[PDB]
Amino acid sequence: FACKTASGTAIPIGAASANVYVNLAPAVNVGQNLVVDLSTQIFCHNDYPETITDYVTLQRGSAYGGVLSSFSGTVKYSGSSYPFPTTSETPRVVYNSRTDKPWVALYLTPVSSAGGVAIKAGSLIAVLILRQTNNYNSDDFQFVWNIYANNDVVVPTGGCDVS
Amino acid sequence: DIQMTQSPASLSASVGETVTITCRASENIYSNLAWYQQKQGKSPQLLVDGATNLADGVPSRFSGSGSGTQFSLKINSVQSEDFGNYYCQHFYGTPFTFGTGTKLEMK
Amino acid sequence: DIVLTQSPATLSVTPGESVSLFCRASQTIGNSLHWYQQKSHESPRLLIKYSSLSISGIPSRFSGSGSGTDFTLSINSVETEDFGVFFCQQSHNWPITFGAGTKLELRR
Amino acid sequence: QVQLQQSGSELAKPGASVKLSCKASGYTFTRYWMHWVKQRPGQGLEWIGYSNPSSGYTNFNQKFKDKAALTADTSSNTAYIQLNGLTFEDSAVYFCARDGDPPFVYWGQGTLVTVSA
Amino acid sequence: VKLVESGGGLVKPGGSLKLSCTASGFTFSDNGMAWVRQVPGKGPEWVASITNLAFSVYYSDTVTGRFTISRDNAKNTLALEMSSLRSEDTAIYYCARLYGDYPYYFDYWGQGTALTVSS
């Protein structure tokens, strides 16, 4: 699983604490503040096709990082929405072709009216512990994607979007 | 969408003794199991977290163990005030369904 | 820190052949290395982005390969317009320290 | 102290539509999710689904996909579930609980709904 | 994509100057900036960089504690107040655009201004 981010980040296999850098994409949904799009930046595939299948399941413990400590939201992991932090484990994402398809969105539940947070570059934005599972054998991995931020855009903490 | 079997249906428990409750799953559930303690005509409560971590408030007589497919619960020196039902519930993938249940009675 | 070493410093090559140049970093980098081409007295222009991908507007005659510590930037066919200096650039950990640059010249 | 309590026994008729109650106080209602339980006497505990107060989105079960419509009132801090088209085997007691923090176990006595011809 | 640099010349050691960078043709608010100096006949040297809104500044090993770099996102300008001249600063300066992850690599390069030191 040696894929890349759209900006060109080198993602190594089995590096545990992963320093992978993505781009922020803020928007607004009803009751949701779209912090970041990992789908439109992380396009992946399988490194050794026709014999293995990349299943990714989000392992427990994961919240936001950096300055955000008591802040929680929602994850869109392959269409349907789930809470974030992890009370459970989301369903899998199938990877079976050599095609750079989108991989997931993070949303924030509004506490203020229209307020926001400033994010610096090199600050942590995801503490995501993942799990890569094959199909031939019932095994499991342990990667800690310490996802940081590249661009600095104002992610809203309120019920609307200010731009 | 997975079916899960808790074993057994019922057993007899005395005072000053040890009981074992076995929670078996088909797929290798990734340690997202919880043990729920139900009373009769009353609100149920938890015992442990993740079948490894004790919840805060109850003493250490209750003990969960196991990971993967085999999940077990050892209870020693059980007393009269915790007679009820045990529900081992899995949390891997929607739906997060309960178990069948385990019935406890006076010996 | 991290220093960049080029090999060779200078190389006079007859046009019409295929050339390959190398840049070596101090530590592990992955594939996070870039190249620049300065033909004459102007701003240098990038050729291959992240050692495997090209930039549109730059032709496919520039190719990159390798990972880890060693990299290769190759030109399959050279002519009278690509002579100049090659710059290699490391972007793994702060701060940024460049390389010397390889001068490629043509016999005339 | 965080606790839940629920409505009384409602007896009704099949084919009707009714929305139930799960009353709460003393905790932040919209920044942590809630889950639902159905109790069948002689069968056991079964899982219904979970809904968001803020976004309003709900993940259901396959059985409760068209059975229930799960909302959660942010202002009144009351967890809601409505059911239309009652059947003879739906006479049961519902339980409501919390989702979020590691523990996330806070329980109530349940809403008992029974229907007959 | 056009990049405009201003502020070059010949100065004594211990002077102070402002280098101004003006950008056009792309999105300024999504993408970082840096300054790169080049000695003629010698490899490039980096001195200063800054991230998106004005959230963080970065320098190289021999630059920290000396330079001032700032940005104005309303008028799309990058400003360098530099006041630590020595004999090694005889170089041509390009204002360049840090695209990609953690603003690392350089997308387009401007013409730059020359800066030389003499007594």
Residue numbers in the entry:
A (entry chain D): 1 to 103, 105 to 164
B (entry chain C): 1 to 107
C (entry chain L): 1 to 108
D (entry chain A): 1 to 117
E (entry chain B): 2 to 120
Provide the authors' own sentences about this structure as they appear in the paper.
To circumvent this limitation, a combinatorial approach was taken in which pairs of Fabs with non-overlapping epitopes were combined with FimH to form ternary complexes, increasing the overall particle mass to 125 kDa. Using this ternary complex strategy, a cryo-EM structure of FimH-DSG TM with Fabs 329-2 and 445-3 was determined at 3.11 Å, with the final map comprising FimHLD and the antigen-binding portions of each Fab, allowing molecular modeling of each component and identification of the molecular details of the respective epitopes. Epitopes of Mabs 329-2 (site 2) and 445-3 (site 3) were mapped to the opposite sides of FimHLD. Despite not overlapping with ligand binding pocket, the 329-2 and 445-3 epitopes are composed of residues in adjacent regions with conformations that change significantly during the switch between inactive and active states. In particular, Mab 329-2 recognizes a novel inhibitory epitope comprised of residues T5, S7, T9, A10, Y21 and N23. These residues are connected to the Glycine loop that harbors the G15A and G16A mutations. As a result, binding of Mab 329-2 stabilizes the Glycine loop in the open conformation that has low mannose affinity. In addition, S80, S81, Y82 and P91 were also mapped to 445-3 binding site. These residues were revealed in previous work as being part of a critical epitope for Mab 824, an inhibitory antibody that allosterically prevents transitions of FimH from low-affinity to high-affinity states. Taken together, Mab 445-3 likely blocks bacterial adhesion via a combinatory allosteric mechanism which modulates both the global state transition as well as the local ligand binding site.
